[PDB]
Design a protein around this nucleic acid. Structure first.
Ligand SMILES: Nc1ncnc2c1ncn2[C@@H]1O[C@H](COP(=O)(O)OP(=O)(O)OP(O)(O)=S)[C@@H](O)[C@H]1O
Ligand SMILES: Nc1ncnc2c1ncn2[C@@H]1O[C@H](COP(=O)(O)OP(=O)(O)OP(O)(O)=S)[C@@H](O)[C@H]1O
Ligand SMILES: Nc1ncnc2c1ncn2[C@@H]1O[C@H](COP(=O)(O)OP(=O)(O)OP(O)(O)=S)[C@@H](O)[C@H]1O
Ligand SMILES: Nc1ncnc2c1ncn2[C@@H]1O[C@H](COP(=O)(O)OP(=O)(O)OP(O)(O)=S)[C@@H](O)[C@H]1O
Ligand SMILES: Nc1ncnc2c1ncn2[C@@H]1O[C@H](COP(=O)(O)OP(=O)(O)O)[C@@H](O)[C@H]1O
Ligand SMILES: [Mg+2]
Ligand SMILES: [Mg+2]
Ligand SMILES: [Mg+2]
Ligand SMILES: [Mg+2]
Lengths: 423, 316, 328, 349, 96, 330
DNA sequence: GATTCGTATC
DNA sequence: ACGGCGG
DNA sequence: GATACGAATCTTTTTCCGTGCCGT
């Protein structure tokens, strides 16, 4: 049929996966096939076409007939009925259950049901359970049709957003992140396919010029399936049809690094910025990206650059923060940051490591402070007929009121600085 | 009341009448004859032949079974996850096709589909790949999720050149025996800006209005693309000429100030021979003017001030 | 009946004869109507230029007594979401036209307010039922319409109305209302309109109401400036001359006296001075930049309010400053 | 209770820190039937709320200080259930729409409109005839709740009256100020604060050693009576019922943190110093301290350094003004709070 | 492709008469085809629920006029437009 | 009774002072029936709402108003949904039949009026959804838009609405009305007063009547039967005394940054408004003859920038100190 | 995209 | 007459 | 023995998908 379906691996050695990752997956899987196995779930996450399920199928074609099929799901509570009958696959029915089919997680209700049902699976009191494996493909979700929801699963389709922290942190859940197929494996396999089609490629007179495309494809995509599809399309072609492969999305920190340091592929700042906006406007249009720029522009040279440049960068960021959510604001801010870091960049710089903004922690602390202040206010209102504005609680009482209400206690009420101390 | 517009009257019915993308069209004809058409994603800009080529491919491939073989779905039709769960019965249908032929599911405007629909389309494309094939047609390929693009062969249609527009215009003219001159057709191509549909519409309007396709008659009913007048205004040396363009060719012609500002933003993004610092300063000034326009001050003085600031940051 | 209507609605054109100013588009659409083929049209231009009137008169010369069964007019006052496009427009296009006047027409007035999903869904309704229906799109801002929608629509640009068209229509209104207008008053009216028919009609109605004896009483330029509350040309010239030549105190006093004589606002004076400044022969080219930047800032601040006495002094300072670099 | 509440004046004759203003309030309360809408503005802690409560007592007699809390809930434009504390009195009402955030519009359009629509007539009804509603922190209304008040208090003024307490009237729109009578509440002089503290220590046992330390309290409070009494109780509790001249004038922790930030900025001017300044600013903001106050105190601590020349101070104040304007028209405060610091240490170098 | 065929007996189908678009000349062997959207066609279900006899009439312009009489009771007139438009499939299914 | 602002509100169109260019037109409408769509814009407290209410009262009367008038203001929701359903349905309504009393006493025009007060607060989509609602039903329904900033009204809507600008009420056109209120409230004032009230109240008669009411309240309270002086009205308004202004400007003349810093620190405790002191400084610095052209040119822009920053809702200590420092370095 | 550790291989 | 067909 | 390569880490607070009436 199709090369990515006709040349599918028949053994693990034909699977395009790294040796160490393969070892980790193998040992984890075998440990999940033990009578009382610490780990109940195996959440494999990664980009598309990284042999996430290919390797699982091959491994369950060996492990299953050793301690005992893959029983794949077919995507409100239909998944409940499926999993209500996916637990009887016990010994003599041990059949690694693979959930590559995700019950619709773009819908709030069945997303919560998916999460709260996999939790019940995690906390099940049954003494014997089948090895549960979930494959989630990390793919940025494009810009919708004006969707004003703009929720978590409306920006990125990732495990973190489908599952809840507890699910992903549960001691009995093992997560093995997957990486794009390296060019070594990609060339090694795209050449095996060519020594199986050297006949047609010879009569086509492309068998001679095969390693050029085998290398260009291996350098353009980490997707094995897309690589094989592009190879099939080029081989069956006649003329000099352009070799185009699928397009992948950059990461958040990848985009930050591109803005700060740049990209080797392009030494043009304008072209790089325009392409980043064109292909990635679902992240370059979120305030967290500008917060990341502010938090990580000091990771250039480990923070050993002029103060004038830092002042210019932060001043521009502040100016663009009052330009509303306009498209020009980000295009100005990122361009200014890149220009500033381009003029000062040289050779000999041991750049630092970037980090995610801590604004979420500050917001959580603000919420905690609010919760603290409210108790003080109502206590006063019921015990001293006292109404105090939250502004005065945050500027005067938060500090004086607990000091007095504790010192008088020193000789129901608050004895500690409202919202914790200032450090 | 019986004539059809030239855009639809002369829509190609065979792959040999689709100008441009020579290599892509040749590949499509080869797929039409050989068979075994892969999953494809056809991107590009408006008016290039992304749907006139997928429909022609489906015609020349399925042929007589083009009624029970081509399940066409587009934005005008509902395409929720429920629809994707019409796309399952069509795939499960067994039809006796010639060897090498497969059913085609033409999902026009796949960039407007919901993500749940795409996540289910993956299931359909995985379970029924041996009987039916999917032909996505879109304007921006990034709107299709990466797992779907992984299973498909991406074919990007480039902008139609002036020669492939002139050749099709000459064919249509010989079929419609209209009168022309070289300068008129050059002006029609110039105003088309790589759009075949817009070129046909402009030629039809010029023929209806006057009959003779010359430069004057074309330009008195079709205006020169305003992005190019914005670019001319932004690249002026002194402020006199820039403000002069802004007034005569943009303000007195009826273009809205907000349209001018948005076009200026895009022009600046794609401007050449300008330093990066200058470009980002101009972007900032255009953003400030956009802010002022959106707040209510849609006046010519704001645009004049923006051009003055651009000149000020150019000359230093 | 039609005698208790505002002049902007009482004088709405009923046939393509009465639409003035836009000659090329009217000629083209008349030829399109006669030839019997009408493409998907898109009308673009400033507000009050005659787009709705033109399309409605065209759809009355194309249908007639069945202009209510053949034309489906949807505008911003109606919901035009994805469901509306998928159901109402699709069912209007799919059905048959009882053979009446060939194709059916769909007029989408104020399409710039339509969501992108609806415009994207309308693409395959425009080009599928083009054999039975023709779509017309009216919009003032072309940046809010998807490029695909612009591709499949024939673009006709409605220019701001020239002086001759305004003069002819003003003469029609005058004859129909038995009014007299002096040439200077007509100049002032055509200049204050800024290529707008609705402004012309409203100002003329206010002028008629201002006159004691609507008949036998003429509308001079003074009446126009009183009713519309705009500065006289002499007032703008006097304020500018005082700013340019006289000292700070005399200029401030003259500005205040001019504004208090007739309660003139500051924004209209700013605009009037801006035009004269645009006409000047400056020789430094930084005068122009400072003038434009400072006066735009002042106008924006005025748009948000504030001390109206600080802003006049700001204007005087901006002018003197800029016109000190001219002598540099 | 606290000495700020225990000694709070509870009548118009008990006010002793401004007599012209008290005479004006008495003149207003002599004929309560034609009382207009009032807007009390002045420095924080001068006693504006105390003066409002005294005026309400004077108009509606004793009965206004018996406050009880009512829980009132709304829903935003979408299905967002929201809660607002409503402390009410048999003769007046008090709400703080700023406590609910940007959605004070629904509060103003529902609670205030409902109270303004009810006539209050009780069998053919100055006292329990019209209603007084106090809007605390009228500055924090988001330019839209002030639009919904223009007609609410102009059309239904026969059965409701509005008296709002705001420190400063810059963020209040012109139409709102136009419909109301502006009442200015100047800060008390140091002598008046000293006299009030002397009265408190006379009714208390703090056992003062010199009446030149109460003057120190007054000078350190910068005209804030609540803060003055808070320090008085602080020292009179930490130093026992004894206030020696060596007793330490206690200042808020965030103030000394801002002073440490100032000293760090003056000493170290480098990118790493900038990052530590950002960390300290984040710590301050984690305590819900408003960013405009942070910027104001940082600027006025930078201007207090004796090692800076006039040009550095002028640049500092210019940057402070620019970044205060930016902060007002902004969404995230950290950007502007960091830009101000960066420019400051780019100028001092 | 589902079909519901009304019987030829006189109790269900009292009278069927096909004309050449003039309502005067009756001919046999020719069929008139009406392609209607069922969204509009379901609008007469609630009216047929109380109908004794229903009269169907269609002209060549593509207008179906459903006449419903109730038992005097109430008279209901529904006018329905025809789609643009499978015809050969219709003919082949009913010849089969 | 009631505040003098809600007690001297014009009841008919003859009580609306200072605005004849619009009141004359609206009065001529009474005899005719061709009232256009109206856009009332002007400074706050100029009489737009009073004018429209008087016109409505004179056109319909108390009985027919409840059926032929719809008023929507910023105190009620006016989103896109409300605009597209409620306003459209009211415009689509048929004109109610006037009674015999109404027809025999009031003109009773054959249309209704939709009054959209505070239309500047409406979103652009809501205003766009009004255009065809006004155009289609113009013969059975009329629209009146009231706003303070005409720029917040979209151009398409401003085109269909006749523009009536309400002038600012200064001491030269509103002195008669304030005098009438004074003589009808038995308010005794010195010569010069009732003009200083209108000078302080820049283009606002609502505030120039509230100030007079407060001055009269205080004067009645003191009880000496003496007139009200300019000093009293100034103090009540919030005007900074001239001596404090002279001290401020002497400190500015000195130039010392710390002296100015401490004087501003002690001045902000007095509670004076930044806008008022900025305005007084503007008057002083511009109308004086002891300063050169360049000084005035620079200070006009400085005051303009400070006023613009203050209008945005910023700290007044930072803005006043910066303005004074800048004025000290020119 | 950067650093750091760890292989695998020539 | 009772069972089945908001986030 | 050099080095290219590779893995880990650098993270979270308008439009569309689901759960009363008739037969025995
Ligand atoms: N050497 C190879 N190793 C692995 N897979 C191969 C190889 N050659 C062909 N394939 C095929 O490539 C495809 C890879 O699919 P997978 O990566 O397992 O699915 P995936 O990771 O879920 O990708 P997505 O996100 O679903 S599109 C399968 O159809 C394999 O049969
Ligand atoms: N390659 C081509 N050769 C000749 N005519 C073409 C070509 N491409 C488009 N056209 C004309 O364009 C019209 C059909 O437009 P389409 O090809 O469907 O546009 P499109 O490429 O699908 O762009 P979108 O996605 O619909 S906006 C007809 O009038 C065709 O004659
Ligand atoms: N060319 C014209 N000749 C005569 N009257 C005109 C002309 N253009 C506009 N008018 C008048 O202006 C009124 C408003 O113009 P319309 O055509 O209805 O609206 P429009 O010009 O389409 O502007 P928009 O975009 O709808 S706000 C009409 O009712 C006429 O009375
Ligand atoms: N021309 C006038 N003659 C008499 N009284 C007037 C005049 N203009 C305003 N007023 C008084 O001003 C007060 C309020 O006037 P309004 O017109 O209701 O307010 P406004 O003009 O709507 O300003 P807004 O609502 O802030 S835009 C009333 O007490 C009126 O009596
Ligand atoms: N005249 C006064 N005499 C004694 N204490 C006063 C006086 N005015 C204000 N205070 C004290 O100031 C404290 C806070 O005043 P407050 O009402 O918060 O002012 P503001 O409303 O301006 O914040 C009160 O607890 C009160 O004891
Ligand atoms: Mg897979
Ligand atoms: Mg297409
Ligand atoms: Mg229109
Ligand atoms: Mg009003």
């Amino acid at each position: 049929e199709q090369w990515y379906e006709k040349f599918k691996p028949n053994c693990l050695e034909q699977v395009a996966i790294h040796k160490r990752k393969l070892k980790d997956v193998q040992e984890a899987l075998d440990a999940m096939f033990l009578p009382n196995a610490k780990h109940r779930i195996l959440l494999l996450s990664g980009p598309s076409g990284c042999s996430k399920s290919t390797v699982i199928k091959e491994l369950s074609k060996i492990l299953v007939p050793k301690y005992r099929k893959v029983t794949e799901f077919r995507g409100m509570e239909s998944f409940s009925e499926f999993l209500k009958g996916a637990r009887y696959l016990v010994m003599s029915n041990l059949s690694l259950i693979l959930i590559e089919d995700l019950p619709n997680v773009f819908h709030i209700d069945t997303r919560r049901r998916f999460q709260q049902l996999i939790l019940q699976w995690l906390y099940s009191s049954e003494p014997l359970l089948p090895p549960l494996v979930i494959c989630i493909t990390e793919c940025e979700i494009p810009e919708n049709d004006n969707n004003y929801r703009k929720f978590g699963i409306d920006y990125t389709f990732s495990a973190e957003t489908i599952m809840n922290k507890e699910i992903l942190m549960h001691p009995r859940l093992k997560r093995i992140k997957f990486n794009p197929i390296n060019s070594t494996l990609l060339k090694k396999h795209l050449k095996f396919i060519c020594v199986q089609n050297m006949k047609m490629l010879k009569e086509k007179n492309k068998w001679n010029k095969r390693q050029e495309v085998i290398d260009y494809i291996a350098q353009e995509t980490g997707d094995i399936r897309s690589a094989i599809t592009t190879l099939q399309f080029w081989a069956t072609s006649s003329g000099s049809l352009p070799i185009s492969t699928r397009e992948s999305t950059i990461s958040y920190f990848h985009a930050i690094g591109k803005v700060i340091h740049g990209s080797h592929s392009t030494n043009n700042d304008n072209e790089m910025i325009n392409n980043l906006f064109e292909n990635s406007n679902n992240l370059l249009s979120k305030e967290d990206f500008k917060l990341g720029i502010l938090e990580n522009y000091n990771t250039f040279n480990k923070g050993e650059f002029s103060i004038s440049d830092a002042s210019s960068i932060v001043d521009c960021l502040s100016e663009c923060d009052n330009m509303n959510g306009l498209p020009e604001s980000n295009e100005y801010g990122l361009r200014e940051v890149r220009k500033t870091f381009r003029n000062i960049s040289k050779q000999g710089h041991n750049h630092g490591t970037v980090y995610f903004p801590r604004e979420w922690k500050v917001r959580k602390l603000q919420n905690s402070f609010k919760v603290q202040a409210e108790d003080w206010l109502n206590v006063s209102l019921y015990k001293y007929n006292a109404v105090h504005s939250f502004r005065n609680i945050t500027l005067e009482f938060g500090y004086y009121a607990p000091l007095i209400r504790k010192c008088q206690s020193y000789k129901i009420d608050v004895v500690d600085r409202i919202g914790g101390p200032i450090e | 009341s019986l004539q059809l517009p030239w855009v639809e009257k002369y829509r190609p019915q065979v792959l040999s009448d689709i100008v441009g993308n020579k290599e892509t069209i040749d590949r499509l004809q080869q797929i039409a004859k050989d068979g075994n058409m892969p999953h494809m994603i056809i991107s590009g800009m408006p008016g290039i032949g992304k749907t006139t080529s997928v429909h022609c491919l489906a015609h020349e491939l399925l042929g007589r079974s083009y009624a029970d073989g081509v399940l066409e779905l587009n934005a005008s039709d509902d395409r929720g996850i429920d629809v994707v769960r019409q796309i399952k019965h069509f795939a499960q249908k067994k039809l006796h096709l010639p060897p090498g032929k497969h059913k085609i599911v033409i999902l026009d405007e796949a960039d407007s589909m919901t993500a749940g629909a795409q996540q289910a389309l993956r299931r359909t494309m995985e379970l029924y790949s041996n009987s039916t094939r999917f032909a996505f047609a879109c304007n921006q390929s990034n709107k299709i999720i990466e797992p779907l693009q992984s299973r498909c062969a991406i074919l990007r249609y480039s902008k139609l050149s002036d020669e492939d527009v002139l050749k099709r215009l000459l064919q249509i003219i010989k079929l419609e025996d209209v009168k022309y001159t070289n300068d008129g057709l050059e002006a029609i191509i110039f105003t088309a800006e790589g759009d075949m549909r817009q070129a046909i519409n402009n030629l039809q309007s010029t023929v209806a209005g006057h009959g003779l396709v010359n430069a004057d008659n074309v330009f008195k009913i079709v205006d020169s693309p305003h992005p190019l007048i914005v670019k001319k205004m932004l690249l002026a040396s002194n402020l006199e000429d820039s403000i002069q363009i802004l007034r005569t060719d943009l303000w007195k012609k009826g273009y809205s100030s907000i349209d001018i500002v948005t076009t200026s933003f895009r022009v600046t993004k794609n401007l050449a021979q300008v330093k990066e610092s200058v470009r980002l300063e101009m972007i900032k000034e255009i953003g400030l003017t956009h802010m002022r326009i959106l707040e209510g001050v849609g006046t010519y003085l704001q645009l004049a001030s923006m051009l003055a600031k651009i000149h000020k940051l150019n000359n230093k | 009946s039609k005698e208790n209507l505002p002049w902007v609605e009482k004088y709405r054109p009923e046939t393509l004869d009465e639409v003035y100013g836009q000659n090329e588009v009217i000629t083209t659409v008349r030829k399109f109507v006669d030839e019997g083929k009408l493409p998907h049209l898109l009308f673009y231009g400033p507000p009050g230029t005659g787009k709705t009137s033109t399309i409605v008169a065209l759809a009355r010369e194309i249908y007639g007594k069945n202009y209510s069964n053949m034309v489906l007019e949807l505008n911003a006052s109606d919901d035009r979401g994805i469901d509306v496009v998928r159901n109402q427009i699709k069912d209007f296009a799919s059905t048959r036209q009882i053979f009446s006047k060939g194709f059916k027409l769909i007029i989408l007035d104020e399409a710039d307010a339509m969501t992108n999903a609806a415009q994207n869904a309308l693409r395959r309704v425009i080009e599928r039922y083009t054999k039975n229906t023709r779509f017309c799109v009216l919009a003032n801002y072309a940046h809010k319409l998807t490029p695909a929608l612009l591709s499949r629509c024939t673009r006709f640009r409605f220019q701001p109305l020239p002086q001759e068209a305004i003069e002819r229509r003003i003469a029609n209104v005058l004859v129909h209302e038995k009014l007299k207008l002096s040439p200077n008053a007509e100049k002032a009216l055509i200049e204050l309109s800024n290529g707008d028919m609705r402004r012309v009609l409203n100002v003329l109605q206010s002028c008629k109401a201002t006159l004691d004896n609507p008949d036998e009483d003429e509308i001079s330029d003074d009446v126009i400036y009183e009713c519309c509350g705009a500065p006289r040309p002499s007032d703008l010239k006097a304020v500018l001359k005082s700013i340019l030549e006289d000292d700070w105190g005399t200029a401030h006093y003259t500005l205040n006296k001019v504004r208090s004589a007739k309660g003139l606002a500051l924004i209209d004076l700013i605009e009037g001075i801006v035009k004269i400044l645009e006409d000047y022969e400056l020789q430094n080219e930084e005068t122009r930049v400072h003038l434009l930047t400072k006066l735009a800032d002042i106008e924006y601040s005025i748009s948000k309010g504030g001390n109206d006495q600080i802003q006049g002094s700001a204007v005087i300072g901006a002018i003197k400053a800029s016109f000190e670099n001219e002598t540099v | 209770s606290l000495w700020v509440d225990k000694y709070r004046p509870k009548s118009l004759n008990a006010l002793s820190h401004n007599e012209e203003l008290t005479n004006f309030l008495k003149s207003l309360s002599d004929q309560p039937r034609d009382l207009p809408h009032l807007l009390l503005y002045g420095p924080n802690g001068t006693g504006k709320k105390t003066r409002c409560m005294a005026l309400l007592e004077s108009i509606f007699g004793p009965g206004v200080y018996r406050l009880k809390i009512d829980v009132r809930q709304f829903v935003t434009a979408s299905n967002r259930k929201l809660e607002l504390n409503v402390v009410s009195s048999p003769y007046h009402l008090e709400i703080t729409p700023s406590d609910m955030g940007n959605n004070d519009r629904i509060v103003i359009q529902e609670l205030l409109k409902e109270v303004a629509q009810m006539e209050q007539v009780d069998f053919q009804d100055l006292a329990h005839r019209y209603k007084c509603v106090i809007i605390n922190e009228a500055n924090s209304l988001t330019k839209d709740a002030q639009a919904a008040l223009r007609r609410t208090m102009e059309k239904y003024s026969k059965n409701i009256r509005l008296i709002m307490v705001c420190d400063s009237m810059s963020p209040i729109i012109a139409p709102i100020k136009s419909r109301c009578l502006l009442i200015r509440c100047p800060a008390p002089s140091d002598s008046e604060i000293s006299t009030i503290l002397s009265d408190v220590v006379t009714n208390e046992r703090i056992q003062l050693e010199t009446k030149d330390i109460l003057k120190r309290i007054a000078q350190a409070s910068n005209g804030n009576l609540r803060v003055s009494l808070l320090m008085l109780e602080s020292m009179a509790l930490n130093n026992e019922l004894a206030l020696k001249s060596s007793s330490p004038i206690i200042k808020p922790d965030w103030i000394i943190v801002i002073h440490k930030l100032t000293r760090k900025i003056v000493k170290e001017r480098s990118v790493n110093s900038l990052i530590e300044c950002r960390a300290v600013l984040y710590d301050l903001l984690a305590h819900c301290i408003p960013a405009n106050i942070i910027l104001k105190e940082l600027t006025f601590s930078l201007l207090d350094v004796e090692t800076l020349n006039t040009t550095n101070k002028s640049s500092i104040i210019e940057y402070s003004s620019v970044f205060d304007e930016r902060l007002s028209l902004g969404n995230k405060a950290i950007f502007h709070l960091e830009g101000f610091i960066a420019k400051v240490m780019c100028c001092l170098d | 492709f589902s079909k519901i065929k009304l019987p030829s007996n006189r109790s269900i189908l009292e009278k069927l008469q096909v004309f050449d678009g003039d309502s005067t000349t009756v001919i046999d062997g020719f069929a008139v085809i009406g392609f209607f959207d069922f969204t509009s066609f379901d609008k007469i279900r609630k009216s047929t629920k109380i109908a004794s006899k229903v009269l169907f009439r269609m002209d060549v312009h593509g207008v179906l006029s459903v006449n419903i009489l109730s038992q005097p009771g109430i008279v209901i007139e529904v006018c329905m437009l025809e789609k643009e438009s499978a015809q050969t499939e219709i003919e082949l299914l009913m010849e089969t | 009774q009631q505040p003098w602002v809600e007690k001297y509100r014009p009841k008919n169109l003859d009580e609306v002072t200072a605005q004849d260019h619009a009141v004359t037109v609206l009065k001529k409408t009474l005899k005719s029936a061709n009232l256009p769509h109206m856009l009332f814009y002007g400074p706050p407290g100029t009489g737009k709402t009073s004018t429209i209410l008087a016109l409505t009262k004179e056109l319909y009367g108390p009985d027919l108003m409840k059926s032929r008038i719809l008023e929507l203001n910023a105190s009620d929701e006016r989103g896109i949904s409300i605009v597209r359903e409620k306003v459209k349905n009211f415009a689509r309504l048929t004109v109610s039949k006037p009674s015999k009393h109404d027809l025999e006493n009031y003109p009773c025009p054959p249309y209704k009026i939709i009054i959209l007060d505070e239309a500047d607060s409406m979103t652009a989509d809501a205003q766009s959804a009004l255009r065809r609602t006004m155009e289609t039903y113009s013969g059975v329904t009329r629209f009146c838009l009231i706003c303070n900033y005409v720029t917040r009204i979209i151009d398409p809507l401003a085109s269909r609405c006749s523009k009536f600008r309400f002038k600012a009420l200064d001491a030269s056109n509103a002195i008669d009305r304030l005098r009438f209120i004074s003589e009808q409230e038995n308010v005794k004032c010195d010569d010069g007063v009732l003009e200083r009230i209108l000078d302080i109240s820049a283009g606002d008669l609502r505030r120039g009547i509230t100030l007079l009411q407060s001055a009269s309240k205080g004067a009645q309270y003191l009880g000496d039967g003496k007139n009200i002086t300019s000093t009293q009205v100034e103090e009540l308004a919030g005007v900074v005394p001239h001596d404090i202004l002279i001290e401020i400007v002497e400190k500015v003349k000195s130039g010392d940054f710390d002296e100015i810093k401490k004087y501003v620190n002690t001045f902000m405790k007095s509670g004076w408004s930044a806008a008022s002191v900025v305005n007084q400084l503007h008057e002083y610095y511009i109308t004086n003859d002891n300063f050169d052209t360049n000084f005035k040119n620079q200070i006009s822009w400085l005051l303009f920038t400070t006023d613009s920053r203050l209008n945005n809702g910023t700290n007044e200590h930072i803005q006043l100190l910066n303005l004074l420092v800048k004025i000290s370095q020119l």
